[PDB]
């Protein structure tokens, strides 16, 4: 939750505030030391020694409020993910089959669907027919219920294409 | 040709992903901004107070 | 020495002046059925130019007690009276300082008056249930200056107590 | 998630309690300084904390302020959790039953045409309720032209909707 | 038709109950009140204890 | 040293296990073991907080069945009538969809 890229921003801000705290604490002529300042920044990051320079203590306090807001928002966003649990489908549009190749897709071995994909003029469907006609292994199923059992035993790896009415009928069973 | 290529809009890609099913970033950049601002402010205050302390100590 | 006392005196004078300006007018602003200003006793719309006392106290018992506190400004008027009494005590203790113990009671009364002013600001904020006027910011800044003047006054008091303890030895 | 005005009162109570600490700590040491009192007030304001007092009065001022701001930031946590729970609520409109299930966002059709004749001569009770809403709206939701309905939807910001053909909707979408 | 559908109340036990309110100050005002009460209690207790300490120091000499 | 005892090590492990804490080590290795264990159990008890919040959010969900549209809106809890009677004739000869 809350970050897929901003974790590196958190770590970089941690190292930067550690450098600022060491620059304040170890330049006044106790709490000095690069490992001591880094471990005090670690102690400020999570919950559980204090500086007395009254200028880097402001840095420690604003970082301390900063990571408090971070862990509060972390608790809130983790509760938000645990609350709704509305997982979505990976495929939305018709170009998604052209966009990826991990989850496979196929049609029936014989019928007007294969002639539609074969005699198509759209380059997207041309790439679809090139992928399905050169698929390894053969994605073509014999009957409709064989394709239904192929999709139901795929666990999100292979899909089947057919008419919309039959698909919506099987969807309601 | 006449509904998709003739049109003045882009592809139907709601954007990066399908929807906002992921991490927030909106408050994150602003709290980063106020952290950088407070960091630079406390850094310049520490610099001027150490300069004043050095000017007081060098001149007794 | 005397410069800090004069700074504390002019800070108390400026705080009392901003408190009087907060009592006077333009305390809050609320767009009624156009905009309008209010000073906790009457409202003035932006016909246009007229003013009327819109401090209507009627339309558990805790809501009625909170409405009774918010009506007629019980907390901030008595807070301003306590600030005036503390300023008079500081003016009486500035000249002819016979006893060195009334300054602590004057500072305690001043800090308690500031705390009652903050409590009255909390009551006036809770009675609002869209922007704010100038006199609310002026009362907040006068609370800041009153807190700083109280810190300076108790600092001068502990310095005088340390001087008395050094001279008694 | 909380406000933009309670925070100033929180800062005012913070600096007032720091004034209380600098008063009473110098009224009876370690918290003799104004930065010491302000720093202990900051440590009492957050969860964690440094320099432990030993007095009755200073510890009871800390106990007053500290559970206070504990409940405040716990309420901040719960309020932000509630706002993010709001953030992943109900999906947008995707069916006519979604239109029948709500009443906040209004909708309209063209004032004339076989579109209005479809709802007027309907037999499905959902579309019958739709025609009951459109025939008894206050004021009239009907526009004279198509572009009038387009401008009515574009000046709504999520308050009014329009029903039309799918080809015309996909063309105006592009 | 003439009761559930003819009227203007299209709630019909609506699930849409978003109500995007941040926070009421009524949850904050009494907590401010007990804050000010505790602060005044601590002020008066500290004042009477230091007054008794000064009286005992003046009586002990 | 300060953490020479087994109770000292167990007590610092208990302090690192919770949020708050006492005796600060000074070593590289002890502080990095604390940093490994401490953010770990931080994420654990934060997940406990969010999980209990999710369970109490479940605890105040949808009210029980109060209308026939409530029966039509669900499919988990089944329902039935008597095998014969004008009750079954009411549903058989109905016009409301
Ligand atoms: O004229 C035709 N009418 C068809 C009618 C149907 C349906 F009505 F849906 F039963 C189907 N199926 C599609 C999926 O469910 C199983 C059988 C196939 C048909 N085909 C073969 P196509 O060449 O693949 O279209 C025809 O030729
Ligand atoms: O015979 C009819 N043919 C129609 C053909 C079209 C178009 F799609 F442009 F070809 C449209 N529009 C679709 C919506 O935007 C405005 C124009 C309306 C038509 N109408 C009016 P309706 O009765 O309201 O459908 C007819 O009567
Ligand atoms: O004429 C009829 N009079 C009925 C009178 C009653 C009673 F209420 F006890 F008086 C009942 N019951 C209500 C439910 O529990 C079992 C007995 C059933 C009746 N039925 C059968 P229905 O057609 O299923 O309503 C009739 O036919």
From Swiss-Prot, chain A:
Species per Swiss-Prot/TrEMBL record: Rattus norvegicus
Task of the protein: Ionotropic glutamate receptor that functions as a ligand-gated cation channel, gated by L-glutamate and glutamatergic agonists such as alpha-amino-3-hydroxy-5-methyl-4-isoxazolepropionic acid (AMPA), quisqualic acid, and kainic acid. L-glutamate acts as an excitatory neurotransmitter at many synapses in the central nervous system and plays an important role in fast excitatory synaptic transmission.
Annotated positions for site Crucial to convey clamshell closure to channel opening: 91
SUBUNIT field: Homotetramer or heterotetramer of pore-forming glutamate receptor subunits. Tetramers may be formed by the dimerization of dimers. May interact with MPP4. Forms a ternary complex with GRIP1 and CSPG4. Interacts with ATAD1 in an ATP-dependent manner. ATAD1-catalyzed ATP hydrolysis disrupts binding to ATAD1 and to GRIP1 and leads to AMPAR complex disassembly. Interacts with GRIP2. Interacts with GRIP1. Interacts with NSF via its C-terminus. Interacts with CACNG2, PICK1 and GRIP2. Interacts with GRIA1 and SYNDIG1. Part of a complex containing GRIA2, NSF and NAPA and/or NAPB.
The family this protein is said to belong to: Belongs to the glutamate-gated ion channel (TC 1.A.10.1) family. GRIA2 subfamily.
UniProt-annotated site: Interaction with the cone snail toxin Con-ikot-ikot, residues: 118
Portion of the full-length sequence here: 541 to 736 of 883
Gene designation per UniProt: Gria2
Name by which UniProt lists this protein: Glutamate receptor 2
From Swiss-Prot, chain C:
GO MF term set: calcium channel regulator activity; channel regulator activity; ionotropic glutamate receptor binding; voltage-gated calcium channel activity
Annotated localization: Membrane; Synapse, Synaptosome
A GO BP annotation: eye blink reflex
Membrane topology designation: Multi-pass membrane protein
Keyword tags: Calcium, Calcium channel, Calcium transport, Glycoprotein, Ion channel, Ion transport, Membrane, Phosphoprotein, Synapse, Synaptosome, Transmembrane, Transmembrane helix, Transport, Voltage-gated channel
Keyword Glycoprotein tagged: yes
Residues annotated as transmembrane: 5-25, 72-92, 102-122, 138-158
Glycoprotein recorded as keyword: yes
Main localization category: membrane
Family named by the database record: Belongs to the PMP-22/EMP/MP20 family. CACNG subfamily.
Binding partners and assembly: The L-type calcium channel is composed of five subunits: alpha-1, alpha-2/delta, beta and gamma. Interacts with the PDZ domains of DLG4/PSD-95 and DLG1/SAP97. May interact with GOPC. Acts as an auxiliary subunit for AMPA-selective glutamate receptors (AMPARs). Found in a complex with GRIA1, GRIA2, GRIA3, GRIA4, CNIH2, CNIH3, CACNG3, CACNG4, CACNG5, CACNG7 and CACNG8. Interacts with GRIA1 and GRIA2. Interacts with MPP2.
Protein name, entry field: Voltage-dependent calcium channel gamma-2 subunit
Swiss-Prot record, chain E:
Sequence intervals crossing the membrane: 28-48
Compartments in which it is found: Cell membrane; Postsynaptic cell membrane; Postsynaptic density membrane
Tissue specificity of this protein: Detected in forebrain. Detected in dendrites of neuronal cells. Expressed in the pyramidal cell layers of CA1 and CA3 and in the granule cell layer of the dentate gyrus.
Induction of its expression: Down-regulated in the pyramidal cell layer of CA1 in the hippocampus by global ischemia.
Record note on modification: Palmitoylated. Depalmitoylated upon L-glutamate stimulation. In contrast, Cys-51 palmitoylation does not affect cell surface expression but regulates stimulation-dependent endocytosis. Ubiquitinated by RNF167, leading to its degradation.
Record lipid sites (S-palmitoyl cysteine): 51
Quaternary state and interactors: Homotetramer or heterotetramer of pore-forming glutamate receptor subunits. Tetramers may be formed by the dimerization of dimers. May interact with MPP4. Forms a ternary complex with GRIP1 and CSPG4. Interacts with ATAD1 in an ATP-dependent manner. ATAD1-catalyzed ATP hydrolysis disrupts binding to ATAD1 and to GRIP1 and leads to AMPAR complex disassembly. Interacts with GRIP2. Interacts with GRIP1. Interacts with NSF via its C-terminus. Interacts with CACNG2, PICK1 and GRIP2. Interacts with GRIA1 and SYNDIG1. Part of a complex containing GRIA2, NSF and NAPA and/or NAPB.
Free-text comment on this protein's domains from its UniProt entry: The M4 transmembrane segment mediates tetramerization and is required for cell surface expression.
Curated annotation (Swiss-Prot), chain F:
Intramembrane portions: 4-19, 20-21
Transmembrane segments: 28-48
Compartments, as annotated in UniProt: Cell membrane; Postsynaptic cell membrane; Postsynaptic density membrane
UniProt superkingdom: Eukaryota
Positions in the Cytoplasmic compartment: 22-27
UniProt binding sites for L-glutamate: 86-87
Note in the entry: The postsynaptic actions of Glu are mediated by a variety of receptors that are named according to their selective agonists. This receptor binds AMPA (quisqualate) > glutamate > kainate.
Family, similarity comment: Belongs to the glutamate-gated ion channel (TC 1.A.10.1) family. GRIA3 subfamily.
Subunit and partners: Homotetramer or heterotetramer of pore-forming glutamate receptor subunits. Tetramers may be formed by the dimerization of dimers. Interacts with PICK1, GRIP1 and GRIP2. Found in a complex with GRIA1, GRIA2, GRIA4, CNIH2, CNIH3, CACNG2, CACNG3, CACNG4, CACNG5, CACNG7 and CACNG8. Interacts with CACNG5. Found in a complex with GRIA1, GRIA2, GRIA4, DLG4, CACNG8 and CNIH2.
Function description: Ionotropic glutamate receptor that functions as a ligand-gated cation channel, gated by L-glutamate and glutamatergic agonists such as alpha-amino-3-hydroxy-5-methyl-4-isoxazolepropionic acid (AMPA), quisqualic acid, and kainic acid. L-glutamate acts as an excitatory neurotransmitter at many synapses in the central nervous system and plays an important role in fast excitatory synaptic transmission by inducing long-term potentiation.
The protein, known as: Glutamate receptor 3
